[PDB]
């Protein structure tokens, strides 16, 4: 693999997908999903221009984070995008800049209470289980309003929007409709809540549908770093 080459290609596809549907490419944030890839591979991405990285497992994330802190690398943004058990919340709160997987209030409160006061608030997204009946992550859409309100008062967090890991679909129509469900909910949150600007939605194979539907952040793993 040439990570630098993949980055530019993915970025071209992102830019193509945004322009094709009348969006500025500036609206879509590329989040490089570096789970199960060595810090050397992240380094190749960092050198090529990538600054935003997503990790699914806490210790693996912190190692990579501590590592690039020691090298002195600036302007990085680390998103934790895997499920978050209670006993591993302290590590996420101390080292990450974003968490995409808030799906119950006890975990949000722990993250709030373990977040060092010198750090800016942890940017958090509420995860919706929009279409996956084999998953236990994410709330139902009916729960969004209540959970968003509870989480919105936590002063060491900053509620920024919604995330969803849709059940896998092959039909492009279903990818788009499911993503549109999320964008509608995102839209509705934004009419009421301050600084709702992030809809984390779309991976390597449903990128186009997700961007057409209104996603602001795609989470690309395979098309950048190869397979896992
Ligand atoms: C939460 C999350 N986002 C993004 C990805 C990236 O998927 P892909 O490799 O197809 O780009 C993954 C892979 O597990 C993921 O779990």
How many domains does the chain contain in total? 1
Resolution (A): 2.6
Give yes or no for a contact between 209 and 192, defined as CB atoms under 8 angstroms apart. no
Q: Using CA atoms, how far apart are residues 70 and 105, in angstroms rounded to an integer?
A: 33
**CA of residue 220 to ligand 1 center, whole Å:** 6
Among 221, 224, 226, 228, say which to mutate for ligand 1: greatest number of ligand atoms within 8 Å of CB.
221
Going by alpha carbons, the residue nearest to atom 3 of ligand 1 is 219
Atom of ligand 1 nearest to the CA of 223: 11
Going by alpha carbons, the residue nearest to atom 1 of ligand 1 is 81
Range 177-182, long-range pairs (CB < 8 A, 24+ positions): 178/130, 178/131, 179/206, 179/209, 179/210, 179/212, 179/213, 179/214, 179/215, 180/213, 180/214, 181/130, 181/131, 181/141, 182/128, 182/130, 182/213, 182/214, 182/215
Q: Method used for this model? A: X-ray
Going by alpha carbons, the residue nearest to atom 8 of ligand 1 is 221
Domain of residue 141 covers 1-228
Assign residue 196 a region (left: φ > 0; alpha: ψ between -120 and 50; beta: otherwise): beta
Give yes or no for a contact between 61 and 80, defined as CB atoms under 8 angstroms apart. yes
114 C-beta closer than 6 A to ligand 1: no
Q: Using CA atoms, how far apart are residues 228 and 56, in angstroms rounded to an integer?
A: 13
């Amino acid at each position: 693999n040439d990570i630098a080459h993949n980055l530019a290609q993915v970025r071209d596809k992102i830019s193509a997908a945004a322009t094709r549907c009348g969006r500025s490419p500036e609206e879509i944030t590329l989040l490089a999903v570096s789970k199960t890839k060595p810090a050397s591979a992240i380094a190749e991405a960092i050198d090529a221009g990538q600054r935003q990285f997503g990790e699914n497992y806490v210790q693996e994330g912190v190692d990579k984070i501590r590592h690039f802190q020691e090298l002195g690398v600036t302007g990085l943004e680390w998103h934790f995008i895997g499920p978050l058990q209670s006993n591993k919340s302290r590590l996420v709160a101390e080292h990450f800049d974003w968490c995409h997987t808030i799906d119950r209030l006890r975990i949000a409160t722990r993250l709030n209470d373990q977040r060092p006061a010198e750090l800016p608030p942890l940017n958090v997204l509420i995860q919706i289980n929009i279409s996956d009946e084999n998953s236990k992550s994410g709330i139902q859409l009916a729960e969004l309003d209540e959970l968003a309100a509870a989480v919105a008062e936590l002063p060491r967090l900053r509620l920024r929007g919604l995330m969803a890991i849709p059940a896998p679909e092959s039909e492009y129509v279903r990818q788009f409709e499911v993503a549109r469900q999320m964008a509608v909910a995102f839209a509705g949150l934004k009419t009421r809540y301050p600084h709702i600007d992030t809809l984390s939605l779309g991976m390597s194979d449903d990128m186009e549908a997700a961007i057409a539907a209104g996603s602001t952040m795609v989470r690309i793993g395979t098309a950048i770093f190869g397979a896992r």
